[PDB]
Amino acid sequence: KYEITTIHNLARKLTHRLARRNAGATLR
Structure with a gap:
């Protein structure tokens, strides 16, 4: 899984x- 990682x-x-x-991602 070295290609996906x-x-x-x-x-x-x-x-x-x-x-x-984040701090301002509560309004909407």
Whole structure:
């Protein structure tokens, strides 16, 4: 599963960027 682990890791930065938008992600 080194192919799925590497492909899923390449798109991990997007999870950290959106993870920040939480305190203001309650309104909507």
